[PDB]
Amino acid sequence: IVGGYTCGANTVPYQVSLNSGYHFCGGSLINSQWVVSAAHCYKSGIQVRLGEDNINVVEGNEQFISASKSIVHPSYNSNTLNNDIMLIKLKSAASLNSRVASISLPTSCASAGTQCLISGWGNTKSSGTSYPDVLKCLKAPILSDSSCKSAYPGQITSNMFCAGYLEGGKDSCQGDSGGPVVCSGKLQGIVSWGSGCAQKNKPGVYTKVCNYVSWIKQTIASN
Ligand SMILES: NCCc1c[nH]c2ccc(O)cc12
Numbered sequence: 001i002v003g004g005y006t007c008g009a010n011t012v013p014y015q016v017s018l019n020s021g022y023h024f025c026g027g028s029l030i031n032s033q034w035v036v037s038a039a040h041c042y043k044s045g046i047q048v049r050l051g052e053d054n055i056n057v058v059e060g061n062e063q064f065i066s067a068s069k070s071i072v073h074p075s076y077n078s079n080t081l082n083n084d085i086m087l088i089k090l091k092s093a094a095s096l097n098s099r100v101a102s103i104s105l106p107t108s109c110a111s112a113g114t115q116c117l118i119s120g121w122g123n124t125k126s127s128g129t130s131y132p133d134v135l136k137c138l139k140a141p142i143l144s145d146s147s148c149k150s151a152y153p154g155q156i157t158s159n160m161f162c163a164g165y166l167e168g169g170k171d172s173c174q175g176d177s178g179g180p181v182v183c184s185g186k187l188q189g190i191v192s193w194g195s196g197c198a199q200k201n202k203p204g205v206y207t208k209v210c211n212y213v214s215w216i217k218q219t220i221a222s223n
C-alpha cells in the first residue's frame with residue numbers, strides 16, 4: 001500500500017496472508033472455511049495465515065491453516081485479468097473471534113463515490129521497494145466507470161472497477177494482490193492489477209465481487 005497508514009493490529013480481522021514459505025498475496029476470509037483471493041495468486045502448497053499483523057513475528061493471535069483445495073474461476077483469462085478471482089478451501093475451519101472474522105459478501109454492487117478500505121502487506125513505495133512487516137490500510141473511493149475506462153482504454157471489462165486517486169500518490173501495490181476492498185462492511189473488490197502503483201492517472205483496478213456472488217455461493221455449497 002502506497003500512501004496509506006498503519007491499520008493497527010487485528011483491526012482488519014478478515015484479512016489473510018497467503019504463504020508459500022513467504023507472504024505472496026492477500027485474501028479475505030468469507031466464512032470459517034473459505035478464502036477469496038485473486039486468480040493471479042494461484043499456486044500449489046498454500047498455507048493461509050489468519051490473525052496476522054506483523055508477518056515476521058509470532059504475536060499470539062495467528063491461526064495457520066493449510067489449503068485443501070483451490071478453485072480458479074472457470075473463465076479467468078491471465079492475459080486480460082478478466083475474472084481475476086479464486087476460492088481457497090481450508091483443511092479445517094478457522095476459529096472465529098474478535099480478531100479473526102469473516103467479511104460478508106455484497107447483495108448489491110457499490111456505486112462510484114463510495115469510500116472503501118483497502119489493506120495489505122505490499123510495497124509502500126511508487127519508485128523502488130520497501131515492504132512493511134505490519135498491515136497497511138488505505139481509504140479510497142470507487143471511481144466512475146467513465147474515468148476508469150479513460151485511464152485504461154480498451155482494458156476495463158464489466159468485471160472490473162477502478163478505485164483510488166487520479167492525482168496519484170495513494171494506491172495498492174505489489175504484494176497487495178488478492179486483498180480486500182471493503183465498503184460499508186461488505187467485500188466489493190479484490191486487488192487485481194494496475195499500471196505501476198500510485199502513478200498519476202493510473203488508479204488501481206479491482207475485481208468486481210458483486211458479479212461473482214452466485215458463483216461463490218454455488219461453489220461453496222458443493223465443495
Ligand atoms: N494497484 C496495484 C496493482 C498491482 C497488483 N499487483 C501488482 C504487481 C506489480 C505492480 O507494479 C502493481 C500491481
Ligand SMILES: [Ca+2]
Pocket residue numbers: 052053054055056057058059062
Ligand atoms: Ca505474526
